[model samples]
Target: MISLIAALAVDRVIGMENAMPWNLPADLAWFKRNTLNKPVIMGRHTWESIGRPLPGRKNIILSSQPGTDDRVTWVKSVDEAIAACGDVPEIMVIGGGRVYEQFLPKAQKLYLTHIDAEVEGDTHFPDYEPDDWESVFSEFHDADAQNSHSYCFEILERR
Candidate 1:
């Protein structure tokens, strides 16, 4: 299965200047819980934003640039990354805009956190037809001291 995961603001923004506009430890913890031990594919900018290979998960970076270490594998395209996974049951596409667009059509599932506030952002999530996917699950959480905004965790599966 190919699963795409991300946290986006109400404006559909994912990032600004290669950095997230907000900090929510609970959201980060949720991400870690879901993606741990799964192979994750990301664009170079996403990898750079993250700064290092996520521990316990196979990190596959999609880029034309040269050089890779034991912790991360560099693939020229999204197809290459999927192929690299071989028989793995699921590969998570965790991205920065362009990477998400490329895999959106092929992604069987989307695990998303939708934040309630709007923020200025340079990068935005690609628009998709709601009819193409069905929301399989959803849960809302109220923001506290650590989490600045209320958000909903939703799981959408291709219809």
Candidate 2:
């Protein structure tokens, strides 16, 4: 299953200056829990911003300048990403805007968290018609000392 994991604002903002706009540990943990041990692919910019490969997962970066890194694979195109993870049962499209847009239609599931607030973001998540997906899982989480904002995690399966 090809899936996407993302947290966006009510206005669809996902990033600012190539990094996350807010810090929500609950959402962050949710990310780890879902993508762990799976093939997680991301755009070059997201990989750069992240600075290193996430442990316990197969990290594939979509990039023009392919380089060798431990536990990381580099693919120049979307097709290559798909080929790279063809053997894997599931792949997570971890994003940076452009990548999410490219794989939006190809992804079978969406792990989305609606951050119940708006903030400054230069990049936004790709738009999709809500009616195309049916929510299979949803739970609300409130702002806490470690979580910067109130958020709700919802898993949407393409119908």
Mind giving the per-residue lDDT tens digits that candidate 1 earns over 1-159?
999999999779999999997998888998999899999999999988999889999899999988466679889977789998778888999998999999999999999999998889999999988999999999999999989899999999999
lDDT of 1: 0.91
Candidate 2 lDDT trough over 10 residues, lowest sum? 63-72
Model 2 Cα lDDT, one tens digit per residue, 1-96: 789999989799998888875777888899999999998999988998899989998889988885767568888999999888868888999998
Best by TM-score: 1
Clashing residue pairs in candidate 1, if any? none
- Displacement of residue 27 (Cα, Å) in model 1 is 0.8
Give me the overall lDDT of model 2: 0.89
